[PDB]
Symmetry: D2
Subunit: 268 residues, 4 copies
């Protein structure tokens, strides 16, 4: 008996086999969940990647900046899962910030249009997905988004940290709306994970100083974490998302669960 047996769950945010969402989707399928996937722009690529998941799942296009995609999404999901069925879960694993808003590009030099695009994709879209999908969610359902703890400023992450602060605030409002449907809304604040993009950044893609700073941050994270932190292993994060999708945290909403090795609880 899987943790998520018979649950119907939408998972956004797969782009590579290193996406946190890929691991969320693998774990959820291992636990009995029936999935619908959403992808942005490179659908042929995403399908090829998702062919490696343990079970079949339909893939729907979703650009969160596209109002038409959002307006049609619930109907497209219902067609995929069948009329008369609703979702039990939704995973938001979507984030973006233009290069001007991250790395060695100075914090003050990021144009607002770039920051605004990043906030749109990384924070506002959590509300936009909830608006689209709550009408097709069952009572007892769960919406989960991916977060990085923004309560203190960090090198390099710059405006992405600001976007996460906005996301945390959005989640608290989404919980008010979601509760009317009997649905929970929460974020998982993960420690650093070496996705393709993060590996590129560590390698200097957004400047050497920024890569060096991120490498220092990752090392400090494992050091501070009482149980350690493995940046090469997304499974503990995926498991935590599944815990929130399950029936086992039924009184938690508007909240943040930290899948970070405990690092945020320790100064040094």
């Amino acid at each position: 008996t899987g943790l998520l047996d018979g649950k119907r769950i939408l998972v956004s945010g797969i782009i590579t086999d290193s996406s946190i969402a890929f691991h969320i989707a693998r774990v959820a399928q291992e636990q009995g969940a029936q999935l619908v996937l959403t992808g942005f722009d490179r659908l042929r690529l995403i399908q090829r990647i998702t062919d490696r998941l343990p079970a079949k799942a339909p893939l729907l296009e979703l650009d969160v900046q596209n109002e038409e995609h959002l307006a049609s999404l619930a109907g497209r999901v219902t067609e995929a899962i069948g009329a008369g069925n609703k979702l039990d879960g939704v995973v938001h694993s979507i984030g973006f910030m233009p290069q001007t808003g991250m790395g060695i590009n100075p914090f003050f030099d990021a144009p607002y249009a770039d920051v605004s695009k990043g906030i749109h994709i990384s924070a506002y879209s959590y509300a936009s997905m909830a608006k689209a999908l709550l009408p097709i969610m069952n009572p007892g359902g769960s919406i989960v988004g991916m977060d990085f703890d923004p309560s203190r400023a960090m090198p390099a992450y710059n405006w992405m940290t600001v976007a996460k602060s906005a996301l945390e605030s959005v989640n608290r409002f989404v919980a008010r709306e979601a509760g009317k449907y009997g649905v929970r809304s929460n974020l998982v604040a993960a420690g650093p994970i070496r996705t393709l993009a993060m590996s590129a950044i560590v390698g200097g893609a957004l400047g050497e100083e920024a890569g060096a700073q991120i490498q220092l941050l990752e090392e400090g994270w494992d050091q501070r974490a009482p149980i350690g932190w493995n940046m090469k292993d997304a499974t503990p994060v995926a498991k935590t998302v599944c815990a929130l999708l399950s029936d086992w945290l039924p009184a938690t909403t508007g909240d943040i669960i930290y899948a970070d090795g405990g690092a945020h609880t320790q100064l040094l």
Copy 2:
């Protein structure tokens, strides 16, 4: 397949059929856990109460202010579960504050000896149980304690709120030690639950004004909670404790999980 199948878990804090720990123990057994119980002082009473749990579990005496009890505890547990077996989980569901430290007795009028007894039982003892039991815990294990959010001052709870603030700090240090064993340490911050003691307090046992204030607090809690809060139902709390005892929050330690309906995330 239960959430906790094959896990060996110690549960402290049962005194009545309304104890949060009673519900923790029922749920954990429903999920396949094999339990050892600890009780304070009234062992015949506790045995009679625990006869109503769905499965048998040995009951061991533990007064957390008694150093001899603590020194012998791991040996007594090992005898109960069998040599060569260790615990996978520990639940601390223990709290006390003398009457002078709660209710209408003025905050300033509580003698230190009373406050100190309350802190001993309610906060220090989380460290004392961990010291006793970590040497008989398996890697991957989990220690969970019960908390009430003390980040803002409240009427009536007075020095018990101070004790919880101390407990939260103790948990963060216990996580450092526990991590050396591969063990997690976390608290569950519950909303208000109408245990026998709380019902007595609402009824005026610690003064009418204090009862009135607590009644107001409970009503506000349900109002603020986006998914509501039922003070007569401990099951959602028990489920959350079981989530932390399980393998599904493997990267969370030194932390607090709020089983409170989301109330702490909303101002009004």
Copy 3:
């Protein structure tokens, strides 16, 4: 000897005699500060309003969404205060959210373009003013912005609360940059103040339910505040801003000071 004697301070955000910034400016002048004022759009109106301040102060136009205004601002300030002089202080008292983002208009129904405009004005602009002005600030200087505590969701404030969460994050990054100049950056989180706009909202301008909710929030604030809260009196807020502008909080930066009667420290 005034608290701010000989300090040169820029104050943004005056639009009426009820603006928090008007009071900040009056108090700072009472304490010896020499001011430069900035205003948005209705300059003749603002001049007429500012004629009531106890001392003369030049008024410069600043629309924070106008890159040309921002690019020219330091030069315009220097002309006002004289070549070879720099500022010791900067006050950001600027906020806006379109009606779709506040009140009874549903949270989900706010278009991104509206939210983005609000975030631009209310959060990003704190970075944009700092970028413009740090090059003309003295060591030991202070940048202060106005904040409302967004750590928990509230009725009616909706996307403005999200904007404040973003502002708090921006302040922490601005402090990193400002520190290179020997300059502090902090926010003052005020309790509710009955400005003209807030009075209109309480009166129903953004819907009756929203007005009712805000009225309830204000009453709860005075109740929770251990020293009370007078929503008709901005002076305690203005004084707190002046404290941060002064030499008396020299080791505080990236931070938030709560001028709220202590309400955020109390649950009830």
Copy 4:
């Protein structure tokens, strides 16, 4: 015109010329305050030390664990300042934890009697001083205590961190009582200061590993602080205490002001 002209202020916690309280007292006198001092045990020593303050101030004995001292304190203060006069300010700069509760002595090995003594002196006593002194405080008055940010666990500080967590909670309750008198209660959370005791600890007095860890913590603090941190300079801390004693933070109570260089706002 000094910041504190004509204010009558009690300052506890002087033991050496490196005590944070010595600097608080020097700065307050420089700003016009008339002081009463309290000292523990070594009164001849304290008098000799306080002879170096810029102005005369009476010294009263106060052991905060001595109920008789506390019961007589207001009468002794009134005799010192004259009948019909009251205090405007109170500074609590008192802390202690036995060696078993700090350094390399393992966290689990601290006996409760030692922890309890530390909590008594370091946390409960903030309530005990307020109880004693509020009846002789003027409206508009201010009580300030010294704090170190305990929200995350640290090496070496061990049970002292737990005591600070308790102190923060006590302050929030003291603010409720103090508000009835028109009096504010707040803490100043300082960065690390090289007092004699701290220098001894860095030098290995509580074990080499603990000294090494504290040295690492101090270095990280200056690094994280956007405006830097000088552990050899208590003046910025003293100034912040004086800001809270003044009339310039009139709407802040139950709160914590961080005089730490901004370090707590930055991850790295």
